[PDB]
Homo-oligomer: A and B are copies of this chain.
Amino acid sequence: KPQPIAAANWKCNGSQQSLSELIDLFNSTSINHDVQCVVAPTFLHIPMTKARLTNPKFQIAAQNAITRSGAFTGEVSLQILKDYGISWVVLGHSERRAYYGETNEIVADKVAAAVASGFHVIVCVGETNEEREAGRTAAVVLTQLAAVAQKLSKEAWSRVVIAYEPVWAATPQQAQEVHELLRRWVRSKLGTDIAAQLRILYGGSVTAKNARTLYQMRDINGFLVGGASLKPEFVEIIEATK
């Protein structure tokens, strides 16, 4: 397996006090194995997190971006993130696909720009319950992945990370099967080396209680964690990637 990633998606949550307490815990947590930890605060909380986080095994990510600075009231661009020394970004999260009109095309454009600008990107994919029940999981997630892949160069794949979100929800067996589906497509289109090096993270419900059983699956390379990542239990989730 490639180097695992334990990523904390704080989503639209946090106060200065609560996040300070949580970051202090992360700072006192000794990460001793080969794992890349990532924390993704809201834009407003990035400066405070950057100033307070000292743990050398952690990188800070944005939860979204648009490609270029300009007349886009309310948005934050990759240019602005880079100026602030942020080099990781989560794109295509199921909530943005749902609420904020992010189509396969929009996601692909964002991903292409980010990796070309040297960002590591966590690209989110996943199918609905209606799509899963119809037997269309592979058709849907590979269409999502194909849209993103069409832009990317060989070298760009070193900075791509995929996160599978079972929007339909999951067992580790079910998760592992979709991760196999994704990796198979990549192997077929981009070759054995890129497929072997690619991190595919599980982005469903992850807790201290289920993280080890998930990480043990052959094609799961870590997690994009929701609610648990605002809690001290995130420590146990990082430990599950040994």
Contact = CB atoms under 8 A, between A and B. Distances in A.
Given A74-B64, A100-B101, A44 B84 contact: yes
A54 interface: no
A76 B11 CA distance: 9
Nearest to A75: B12
A96 B72 CA distance: 8
B12 A70 contact: yes
Contacts of A83: 15-16
Contact of A70 (B13, B16, B43, B70): B13
A207 interface: no
A72 B94 CA distance: 10
Nearest to A14: B80
A97 B81 CA distance: 24
Contacts of A46: 44
A146 to B, nearest CB: 23
A9 interface: yes
A38 interface: no
Chain A interface extent, by class:
35 or more
A101 to B, nearest CB: 5
A25 interface: no
A234 to B, nearest CB: 17
A197 interface: no
A241 interface: no
Given A43-B42, A44-B80, A72 B11 contact: yes
B101 A73 contact: no
Q: Which 7 A-B pairs have the closest CB atoms?
A: A64-B74, A43-B43, A47-B47, A12-B72, A73-B93, A63-B74, A15-B83
12 contacts: A9-B73, A11-B72, A11-B73, A12-B69, A12-B76, A13-B70, A13-B80, A43-B76, A45-B80, A72-B95, A72-B99, A73-B93
Interface of A: 9, 11-16, 42-48, 63-64, 66, 69-77, 80-81, 83-84, 90, 93-96, 99-101, 226
